[PDB]
């Protein structure tokens with residue numbers, strides 16, 4: 001919690017033009033006319049095996 | 064859920080993935096692609112990332128009224144956003160803050176104890192004179208500015224411009240005072256010497272003793288060094 | 295145009311009835327050409343132009359409840375136009391998907407009924423998906439499974455389709471991809487722990503090996519040059535390496551695929567034989583050699599615990615490695631004493647001090663045998679470590695610099711003995727300075743020989759763990775408490791030039807810091823506290839300095855008890871046994887060719903018809919499970 005306070009106090013020190021450069025997220029079309037700044041986190045799960053029907057891109061890969 | 068510390072409700076809302084169609088837009092967790100065991104997820108950051116007035120990441124860290132902030136910042140977007148800010152700019156700013164302050168404590172010692180004079184009616188340090196040299200000129204100019212750059216900035220923090228010292232600073236942020244007191248006593252000892260008082264040396268020793276004492280703030284850059292300083 | 299996009303969309307949501315007239319509209323346009331362009335033109339309108347995705351690939355990526363009937367319509371249309379062969383065996387033209395077919399899609403989407411229908415329709419069961427997604431760069435840019443449809447069904451836990459593919463006789467089980475891997479190399483790569491996945495990759499290894507029934511799959515090496523037995527030792531896959539190395543097949547006609555054989559059994563007492571073909575250190579790359587010298591994995595203690603790797607590493611210690619370790623101790627303990635006796639046991643008045651190890655006459659055979667022993671043994675280390683660290687296989691990329699730091703300190707101590715002789719003959723003033731650092735490092739290197747005993751060895755690891763990792767935590771907080779009271783006490787100390795008769799101080803700040811060293815180590819006085827400005831105020835900062843020092847010493851003990859007092863004793867016990875395991879295999883390389891054959895383990899055991907293997911015997915007494923014994927080599931029990 002001492003580091004987590006230190007990170008957010010360093011972000012307030014930055015100017016307006018430099019906070020936009022280090023901004024996280026990307027525009028992802030999650031629905032019809034719904035663009036959200038989403039952040040990607042990958043996961044490798046071996047235990048549960050299901051067929052995949054809920055997805056945004058049918059082509060797998062960071063393209 | 065971020066203000067009251069309700070971690071199990073805050074875990075559900077922040078990672079809500081609705082599989083059934085026509086209610087897909089009520090989700091905050093989306094799967095972009097999947098191939099066997101490898102899958103890619105997308106976490107919504109509408110009111111979570113620190114780009115608005117009140118965000119979930121800002122409320123959770125600065126909440127000194129709850130006792131479960133470690134259980135709430137462990138959650139997968141709040142963990143990752145707090146980790147990606149460290150790798151981009153916060154580790155570089157923390158090391159850069161260490162370099163200007165470690166040079167600040169040495170220069171206070173070199174102007175106070177590295178001058179052998181017989182008596183010469185002892186001059187107080189940080190007193191800008193001529194005929195001296197650019198080595199000592201760049202030294203005392205660095206100490207004079209950096210003592211004021213802390214005193215003004217901490218003068219914004221503790222005082223009138225959003226003082227925040229009700230219970231916020233006085234609970235988990237006690238380092239704001241000790242950087243402020245050390246910055247004043249450098250400036251105040253110069254004012255006592257120009258006003259011809261006998262307390263110019265006494266305020267300077269407590270300024271240098273508190274200056275090396277405040278080096279324990281920079282122990283939080285490492286985990287093993289940081290956990291040892293908490294004990 | 296509009297005709298192409300409607301066919302791609304109709305196979306996506308599941309409009310079965312809409313797809314009917316769209317294939318009729320594609321069929322009504324065929325009667326304006328002849329048979330040279332009609333099979334060509336249908337490939338342009340059923341596939342893409344930039345990626346190569348077909349209508350069959352689009353329907354299988356979108357799993358809908360009408361996915362079974364929609365495949366039967368599209369494949370029947372290709373049969374009527376006699377284009378079924380190039381339709382089902384189509385591939386992506388994309389660089390990140392090159393080689394992926396429609397069969398690779400249906401296997402991953404858990405469609406066993408559709409994948410059985412594609413193979414009967416004529417799909418290629420030996421498709422090689424050589425794209426950039428299926429062969430990643432370092433980690434997690436994709437998913438490497440083996441680039442074959444047999445490996446995709448095996449690595450995604452689909453045992454019904456693996457049995458379907460092996461019965462099909464166009465399936466080449468011994469196929470090798472761009473990485474040189476086959477079906478058994480790829481199962482070692484994707485394998486993980488039992489907590490991580492399951493034990494299913496061990497069961498997939500069992501099913502495929504028994505169907506082949508030969509020693510062709512575990513003998514073939516990849517482009518790197520490793521067997522599937524040697525990838526388990528290189529990558530650190532302990533659960534797969536446990537299964538292969540102790541594989542006992544009970545069912546006959548596949549008995550020769552075993553690496554564990556039972557020689558005899560009588561009730562609870564049984565005798566086993568472990569195969570040592572590529573395990574014992576008699577070839578170039580062996581399992582015992584790869585596992586010990588692998589500084590890229592963090593589970594060497596779990597792999598050398600296994601029953602033949604434990605026993606071979608223990609039998610080498612009892613035969614020659616304990617005797618060589620004690621003999622190395624005796625020549626080096628005599629080496630450190632003789633350096634001291636030639637340097638401090640000579641009382642001479644001045645006589646223009648002679649440097650030691652200088653061979654003169656008229657001296658005696660006591661000192662002659664002494665200095666000749668030191669001169670040779672310093673060169674015997676410097677040449678041998680000159681082979682190790684340097685040109686003759688230097689190996690200092692990450693191998694020596696990770697778990698073998700003793701190679702440098704024996705080398706530096708050997709040079710400084712030789713270099714100090716060279717500085718004295720060249721008439722320089724550094725002959726004595728290099729000799730003291732040679733003797734101080736010589737007694738410091740006696741901690742290498744602590745690994746002969748367990749209790750002595752575990753204690754020396756804890757010393758190396760505190761100094762290299764945990765002392766800089768103590769020091770960096772000590773100096774800020776040193777200089778915190780250092781600038782405070784320096785203003786209290788009255789200046790030394792009061793008399794200047796015995797004044798040899800180094801400054802006001804230097805007097806305050808040096809007294810805080812002496813008061814910590816226990817050599818402090820009270821001469822400055824009496825002759826100070828404020829004597830009572832000078833004492834209270836010294837009392838506070840002791841309290842802060844005791845807090846620093848008391849939190850070092852809590853930090854060395856981090857979260858469990860047992861796990862500190864565990865990590866010093868695991869990495870001690872790797873220091874002995876490296877020491878055993880380095881002593882084996884020192885032996886000549888005729889002497890390694892004398893201490894070789896194993897014996898010829900006829901395990902099958904014309905199958906003689908160097909097996910090692912390990913006895914076992916098991917009381918829990920009671921079975922009748924039908925799998926045995928000798929019907930007469932006993933070591934005869």
Ligand SMILES: CCCCCCCC/C=C/CCCCCCCC(=O)O[C@@H](COC(=O)CCCCCCCCCCCCCCC)COP(=O)([O-])OCC[N+](C)(C)C
Nearest residue numbers: 002234235236237238241269272273276277278279280838
């Ligand atoms: C005359 C008597 C002789 C000396 C007495 C013995 C001195 C030995 C002192 C040793 C220091 C350690 C214990 C002190 C108290 C904790 C540190 C602190 O200030 O709080 C904060 C800063 O912590 C930092 O890391 C920044 C500065 C550290 C030292 C500040 C000076 C303290 C001495 C004062 C005067 C010394 C005299 C200087 C001359 C004027 C802790 O960080 P936080 O962000 O708030 O989060 C934790 C919240 N919590 C703690 C509430 C859980």
Ligand SMILES: CCCCCCCC/C=C/CCCCCCCC(=O)O[C@@H](COC(=O)CCCCCCCCCCCCCCC)COP(=O)([O-])OCC[N+](C)(C)C
Nearest residue numbers: 696697698699700703731734735738739741742757758761
């Ligand atoms: C001037 C300052 C005053 C003295 C300072 C205090 C000295 C006190 C020192 C105390 C020794 C203990 C800590 C030292 C570092 C660890 C031991 C080591 O070297 O590595 C190896 C040697 O394995 C040995 O144990 C043999 C030699 C031990 C001492 C080597 C000299 C180090 C002194 C330095 C110069 C002293 C001056 C000598 C004169 C030139 C450890 O074995 P390993 O096979 O690599 O496996 C472990 C791998 N791991 C560690 C990466 C996990």
Ligand SMILES: CCCCCCCC/C=C\CCCCCCCC(=O)O[C@@H](COC(=O)CCCCCCCCCCCCCCC)COP(=O)([O-])OCC[N+](C)(C)C
Nearest residue numbers: 154155157158159161278281282284285286770771773774
């Ligand atoms: C406008 C344009 C500007 C130009 C460009 C600007 C950019 C250039 C900026 C910077 C230049 C280049 C930097 C590159 C990255 C290095 C940063 C780094 O090392 O991180 C360190 C931060 O830094 C510190 O923590 C320093 C403080 C030392 C720790 C304790 C000593 C102090 C207390 C005792 C007193 C002793 C002192 C002596 C006695 C008084 C540590 O971070 P980390 O550990 O690596 O993080 C990993 C997290 N982990 C912990 C989980 C592992």
Ligand SMILES: CCCCCCCC/C=C\CCCCCCCC(=O)O[C@@H](COC(=O)CCCCCCCCCCCCCCC)COP(=O)([O-])OCC[N+](C)(C)C
Nearest residue numbers: 162163165166169170173174177178196198199201202203
């Ligand atoms: C890293 C740990 C050790 C740190 C260094 C050891 C500490 C001290 C080193 C040595 C002890 C004393 C020997 C001489 C001191 C240097 C020169 C001098 O005399 O100072 C003079 C000015 O001083 C200043 O105003 C500027 C500071 C000078 C640079 C020294 C610290 C650099 C550390 C970088 C830190 C940045 C962070 C780095 C990233 C971590 C003092 O004035 P003077 O009385 O008139 O002296 C006359 C002599 N003269 C004419 C020749 C000038």
Ligand SMILES: CCCCCCCC/C=C\CCCCCCCC(=O)O[C@@H](COC(=O)CCCCCCCCCCCCCCC)COP(=O)([O-])OCC[N+](C)(C)C
Nearest residue numbers: 612613614615616617618621674881883884885886889892
């Ligand atoms: C030189 C550079 C410096 C480097 C130093 C090292 C350099 C060399 C590197 C490594 C060698 C280290 C020493 C040898 C091995 C020691 C370990 C050991 O176990 O001892 C074994 C010695 O081995 C024997 O079997 C004894 C045979 C001696 C007869 C020699 C005559 C012919 C060889 C010609 C000789 C000249 C060579 C060829 C020249 C023409 C004894 O076995 P044991 O276990 O004790 O079993 C007894 C137990 N029991 C009685 C209960 C049954």
Ligand SMILES: CCCCCCCC/C=C\CCCCCCCC(=O)O[C@@H](COC(=O)CCCCCCCCCCCCCCC)COP(=O)([O-])OCC[N+](C)(C)C
Nearest residue numbers: 616617618619620621623740741743744745746747748750
């Ligand atoms: C070419 C023909 C050659 C002729 C024939 C050649 C053959 C004849 C050869 C040899 C002659 C006969 C030997 C027979 C077997 C005895 C050896 C032995 O005991 O093994 C010892 C090895 O040896 C050492 O470890 C010595 C080092 C002592 C450790 C601590 C002192 C060093 C550091 C402190 C500094 C203090 C020193 C003073 C201050 C500087 C230990 O092994 P073990 O423990 O018994 O093994 C059991 C494993 N256990 C751990 C599970 C229990």
Ligand SMILES: CCCCCCCC/C=C\CCCCCCCC(=O)O[C@@H](COC(=O)CCCCCCCCCCCCCCC)COP(=O)([O-])OCC[N+](C)(C)C
Nearest residue numbers: 624625627628631632635636639640658660661663664665
């Ligand atoms: C085991 C723990 C204790 C170790 C022993 C205690 C340490 C020391 C014992 C006593 C302290 C000093 C008293 C006299 C020293 C002996 C003789 C001498 O004078 O040395 C001389 C030569 O020295 C050499 O070159 C050879 C070494 C001599 C044998 C001594 C160590 C044997 C240990 C075996 C270890 C192997 C491994 C064993 C397995 C573990 C010194 O030369 P000098 O200055 O000209 O002296 C003139 C006197 N003189 C003419 C009479 C020669």
Ligand SMILES: CCCCCCCC/C=C\CCCCCCCC(=O)O[C@@H](COC(=O)CCCCCCCCCCCCCCC)COP(=O)([O-])OCC[N+](C)(C)C
Nearest residue numbers: 285286287288761762763764765766767770853854855856
């Ligand atoms: C200018 C820049 C800033 C400079 C100031 C700061 C510099 C940084 C200084 C200390 C912080 C450590 C940073 C290392 C890398 C970061 C990763 C990390 O988390 O640290 C870890 C990596 O452990 C190490 O690598 C220790 C660093 C020393 C390496 C060897 C130097 C020789 C020691 C010479 C010694 C002196 C000779 C002795 C006699 C006099 C440390 O973790 P740990 O401590 O092992 O905790 C484990 C305990 N537990 C499992 C129970 C929890």
Ligand SMILES: CCCCCCCC/C=C\CCCCCCCC(=O)O[C@@H](COC(=O)CCCCCCCCCCCCCCC)COP(=O)([O-])OCC[N+](C)(C)C
Nearest residue numbers: 261262263264265268269272273276774775778779782785
């Ligand atoms: C964690 C790291 C370490 C932490 C910090 C280390 C411990 C910090 C503790 C103490 C810091 C140092 C205290 C003394 C400083 C001045 C000494 C001096 O020079 O005396 C001189 C100045 O004379 C005076 O004016 C003051 C004399 C002492 C006043 C004592 C009050 C402070 C006690 C502590 C309470 C403070 C509360 C602190 C908060 C708890 C006397 O010299 P003179 O020639 O006879 O008189 C002529 C005057 N002239 C020279 C200017 C012309």
Ligand SMILES: CCCCCCCC/C=C\CCCCCCCC(=O)O[C@@H](COC(=O)CCCCCCCCCCCCCCC)COP(=O)([O-])OCC[N+](C)(C)C
Nearest residue numbers: 168169170172173176177178773777799800801802803804
């Ligand atoms: C990594 C630390 C070790 C290396 C850096 C050393 C840092 C400095 C530490 C100690 C000083 C050692 C070198 C400086 C000058 C020589 C001696 C001296 O002090 O006396 C001088 C005045 O005496 C004073 O009163 C000056 C001391 C105050 C300024 C020095 C501390 C700087 C910041 C604190 C440390 C910040 C960094 C600490 C972070 C850990 C006069 O010298 P002399 O007595 O007449 O003798 C002649 C000198 N000669 C023979 C050498 C020619």
Ligand SMILES: CCCCCCCC/C=C\CCCCCCCC(=O)O[C@@H](COC(=O)CCCCCCCCCCCCCCC)COP(=O)([O-])OCC[N+](C)(C)C
Nearest residue numbers: 826827828829830831832833834835836837838839841842
């Ligand atoms: C962690 C515990 C360590 C202490 C606090 C740690 C922080 C330390 C910081 C600041 C501490 C406070 C600084 C006080 C300065 C001394 C002034 C004084 O007393 O008058 C006189 C001494 O007269 C005496 O002799 C009094 C006896 C001294 C000890 C008291 C007995 C304790 C019994 C009760 C049990 C309670 C035990 C204590 C409470 C725990 C004069 O003393 P002087 O000034 O040196 O002489 C100069 C003359 N001049 C002024 C005319 C020039």
Ligand SMILES: NCCOB(c1ccccc1)c1ccccc1
Nearest residue numbers: 001004132133136137142145146
């Ligand atoms: N498992 C450790 C996760 O660490 B957390 C963390 C995240 C980013 C940077 C540094 C640490 C963390 C956990 C609770 C509160 C605050 C931060």
Ligand SMILES: NCCOB(c1ccccc1)c1ccccc1
Nearest residue numbers: 156157159160209212213216242
């Ligand atoms: N001195 C004005 C700001 O100080 B900084 C600062 C002040 C007190 C505590 C911690 C940091 C600073 C921040 C980032 C980089 C460099 C310095």
Ligand SMILES: NCCOB(c1ccccc1)c1ccccc1
Nearest residue numbers: 594595598599607608871872875
């Ligand atoms: N149960 C203790 C077995 O010890 B092992 C061992 C084997 C031979 C000689 C000495 C020790 C061992 C275990 C893991 C790694 C390396 C060696």
Ligand SMILES: NCCOB(c1ccccc1)c1ccccc1
Nearest residue numbers: 618619621622625674675678704
């Ligand atoms: N000095 C040349 C070889 O040294 B040996 C050696 C040198 C350094 C560290 C460990 C061993 C040696 C090995 C076995 C028996 C005797 C000596």
